[PDB]
Amino acid sequence: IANQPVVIDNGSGVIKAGFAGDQIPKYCFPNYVGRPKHVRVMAGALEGDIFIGPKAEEHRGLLSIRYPMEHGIVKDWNDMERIWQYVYSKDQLQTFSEEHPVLLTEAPLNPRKNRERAAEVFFETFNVPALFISMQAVLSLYATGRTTGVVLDSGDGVTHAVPIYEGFAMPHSIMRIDIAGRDVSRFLRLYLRKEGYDFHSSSEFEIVKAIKERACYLSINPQKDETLETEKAQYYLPDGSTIEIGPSRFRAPELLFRPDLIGEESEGIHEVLVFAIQKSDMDLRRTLFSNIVLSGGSTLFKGFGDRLLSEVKKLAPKDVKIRISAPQERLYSTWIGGSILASLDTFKKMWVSKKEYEEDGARSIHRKTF
Amino acid sequence: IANQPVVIDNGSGVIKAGFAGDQIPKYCFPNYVGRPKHVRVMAGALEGDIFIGPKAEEHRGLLSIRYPMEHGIVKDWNDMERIWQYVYSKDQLQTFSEEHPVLLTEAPLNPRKNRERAAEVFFETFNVPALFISMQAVLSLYATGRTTGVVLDSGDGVTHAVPIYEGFAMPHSIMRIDIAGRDVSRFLRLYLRKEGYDFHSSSEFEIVKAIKERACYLSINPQKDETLETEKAQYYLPDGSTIEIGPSRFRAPELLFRPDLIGEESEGIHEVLVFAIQKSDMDLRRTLFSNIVLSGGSTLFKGFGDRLLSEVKKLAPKDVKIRISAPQERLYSTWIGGSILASLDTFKKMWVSKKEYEEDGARSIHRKTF
Amino acid sequence: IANQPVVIDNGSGVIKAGFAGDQIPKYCFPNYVGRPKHVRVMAGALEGDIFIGPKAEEHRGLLSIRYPMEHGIVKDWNDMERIWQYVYSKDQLQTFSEEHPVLLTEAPLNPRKNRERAAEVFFETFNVPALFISMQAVLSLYATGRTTGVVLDSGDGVTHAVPIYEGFAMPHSIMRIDIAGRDVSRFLRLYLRKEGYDFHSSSEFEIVKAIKERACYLSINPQKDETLETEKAQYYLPDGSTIEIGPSRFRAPELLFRPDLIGEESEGIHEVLVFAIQKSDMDLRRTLFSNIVLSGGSTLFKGFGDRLLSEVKKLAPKDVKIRISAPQERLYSTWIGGSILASLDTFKKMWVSKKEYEEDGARSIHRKTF
Amino acid sequence: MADPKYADLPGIARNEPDVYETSDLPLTSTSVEHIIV
Amino acid sequence: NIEIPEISLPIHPMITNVAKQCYERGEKPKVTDFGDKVEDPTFLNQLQSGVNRWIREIQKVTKLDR
């Protein structure tokens, strides 16, 4: 028994959290940790070293922003502890980690050590009454209400497709590549350098993310538009300068459909969907093609869904109704799905109790991983 | 042993000193050693061979002036020792050099030897219990309330720009040129020689300073008064003579904005500030453009604020709001900040004890430089 | 028309020219346009009033100095046009710029506008029949006769590393940071200003470059020597003076291995090499670690290769054979390889003729450059 | 403030504007489907 | 129980007078309400002494440890 389950949606770029039963996540902020770079000289300065959340975003110039999680895998656990601890601070939740069971979203095909050490972190430093690690696609489909269909997500560090059949997420059809939002921003940074504009500071990579979020689009024809000179719209920096982008705005999110530009034998998003559908039972292909759900912030580019339809039509068999849905809460899909899932009475039997974790250990988590 | 620390504004043009906690510096005498030029014949004449401050300001004609410090770098240590002894003398403080902590300011980017020898004097000739060397930028922020800003001071010898944001100084963005009030006075002297009025003695050099402070202004435009060949405003000398100037009461202070007139490629004061801001981080530009602090006596010329605004406005990107806070205590801002800092208790942790220096030496001073 | 082609090897600090076939670039001169500061009076003095070449080195003090290429990016196209005309002048090659194909050189990952405008110059002002812009790594490999090996070079403005495996350039495994010899000279000037020897004039900066190129060594132990006492070896200026460098002679070239000293989050040269190797495949890292060809001007410091092997062994996995080869004339490696490449028979197909430029334009250059 | 304090020392400039300033001035759709018969 | 003491930090009574005057009407207290009283060096000197005493009192509690 506890108060209420807290759905903490992780993400390599933006963490999202709130209590279960909530409508929208009330607490969302970037998943980075910024510590100052300069020298504390004057007294009365910004006290404290590590900053997370709105304060780290505000005084962005001083920090040396780093990410503790990359490609859905935690690289530094200390920064993650401070991030989770920040989630439970007075600025976000104002609660205690002893009276709340925790729903935790997590990307597929990740190492066992993520669930194991993350569970140790929660049940030991936080001592939560109940932890429950789950997928992300299952939650997104629960958020849309329907039940069978694939889920195409592309967050900040991962991207995958999961063919879900009535909740049983088919584990033998989850294609997963590691080319997501942050990497698109990284490649955009490279193209900005090729344009002439240099951005290499860690607290400037964020400006590159801002440019990706408000100045890029997806060309329908990938090559016909490359053979033309666009209008070259400008961009206003926080500094007040001006950057004319040019061709570095459509080729930047082109990476998601062709990771040859980054030099990698992986596949595009369209191939992840088509391979995820084709590596399933032939009796469900039409049902999966009639139900595609997008989620994740990288599915917010202009002309994304339209280009995805064109690509899938080029790869799907002829005269099969393809249908891509795209709800208005792609950033909040996994969190809303967590709010629906954890607010049910079956969640009591679906979690892992603290007592159980102390009895068996990590094997209990891998046992009851679904 | 400590009671009311002694704040010393070791400025190359005028030394300002008093105790800690004092709202105003009680003793502001000029920084020069006056030695006589004419032999003493009559008994009962003036006593001593060294005149400092108020005495070397009334009997100026009898003296030959030797500035000890030039461009924030001490030349004759003997003279600085004598000036500091004058500070602790009966006519100035009546204290001992062993009962009070000493806060002695310093310009940024000075050589290490100044710090070393300054502490050697204050720890060997004077047996000061506590010594702390500071920056002449942080102190102005203290005495002006702000904690984020660009300190643009122009003392009599060295001008610089230090961008401090939220109490954090960004040392790599410090720009510093060695062209200030001395050069303006000296260049004014050359303009008087081109206008037929020579001055070569050291005692008459202060009359050139007097002309500068009482008759020099800055035109908003460098050519709207250049070819106009304006009126010749008269100005009286200390004897009763008459000097008409005309094209030198504005041509001499433009040496700060363009030191090409002195025959030295460097950057003007406006380029010092703008380059100090542009060298800082991308996110911190608007806050530094809206927080510009002025200090130093050379920032008292007429029309200085308007010229500084228009020059920065030309160099800053469009529509960026530029605010230049110009307090009325530009001469005593650094001292008042010193009186504030030494009145705190964190200063106790910030100084260097005598045994600290004895067991370590110069190393201890370079350790607590910031 | 296909005569002896001209191999122009650009460099942000020292240009290199000469015909294809010469074993040594017969015409080398620094890359700076010097123009006089002082007013000329005596009729019959130096003429042209824009000095480029050895005349700019013989009369350094008389003129101002401004570099037209910073970090491999051309900032002033007018000055580069004058420099290239000087390459074709009566003092360097004495030939016409239309009877010879030109082999230019560039640092990788440069902006496309440099390549565009550079070929615009070589095809519009100079009516060169054929131009072929190319990298530097490939050229140093043609010079050493090899076909494999990671080429690491630290020029005056660009420190990049491009790996090549049997003639297959890996474009995505290229690391380039703009922290080079010019910035080391600048950091040295900053430390000299912290010493007392404040060199500030533009023509005086070359003296700092000479001091860097002569009295500077890289200690193997970073913090051991970085925190201890020096010996203060004396150096003779061109004035006939004497300067005691001291501790800055070793802390100034440390910038190449840790750019945190200048306050810029980047990587050292060793991290550049290690990351450039690791970004490649898994079946090539052994051949790349066993074949490292140094080049570039700044890879001549005393005690440089020692520190590279130490840092690389700390970064590379254990028991991996690490070798570092280098040519004898390290300053003219790329030019020699350019002479070899341009003197081949495939160079007739490698270039871009003038008719090709008239048909397509910039697009043809971007196509045939890779 | 300390007005008599400023009367004491000689550098404090009165009747000069103390602050110089620059002038001032006053998501995608859903169900992107495509049938095929 | 050791029962750590408490300190009631005094305030200048004139400030409370004008504060209560701002409270009799619906209005937030502000610096502008004192008029030409802020410029009094006597008044500000009294205030400086009071805040200095406040710092003393708070240090009496913050430096405490057992």
Ligand SMILES: Nc1ncnc2c1ncn2[C@@H]1O[C@H](COP(=O)(O)OP(=O)(O)O)[C@@H](O)[C@H]1O
């Ligand atoms: N409007 C936008 N256009 C393109 N990309 C965006 C946009 N908004 C956010 N992003 C990218 O999407 C990412 C958000 O996905 P995220 O919520 O992090 O997924 P997860 O939380 O599962 O990691 C952010 O990293 C951001 O880079």
Ligand SMILES: Nc1ncnc2c1ncn2[C@@H]1O[C@H](COP(=O)(O)OP(=O)(O)O)[C@@H](O)[C@H]1O
């Ligand atoms: N009213 C004034 N107007 C213009 N310049 C002044 C005025 N008063 C003083 N100065 C100049 O400014 C200098 C003041 O020295 P200061 O700026 O305090 O140097 P430092 O900061 O090194 O003590 C004087 O030497 C004089 O050159």
Ligand SMILES: Nc1ncnc2c1ncn2[C@@H]1O[C@H](COP(=O)(O)OP(=O)(O)O)[C@@H](O)[C@H]1O
């Ligand atoms: N003995 C030396 N020690 C250290 N650096 C040196 C020495 N000799 C030359 N250099 C550096 O070599 C650089 C020249 O490199 P350069 O061949 O011009 O590269 P690029 O041609 O790519 O510009 C100069 O900037 C100088 O700093």
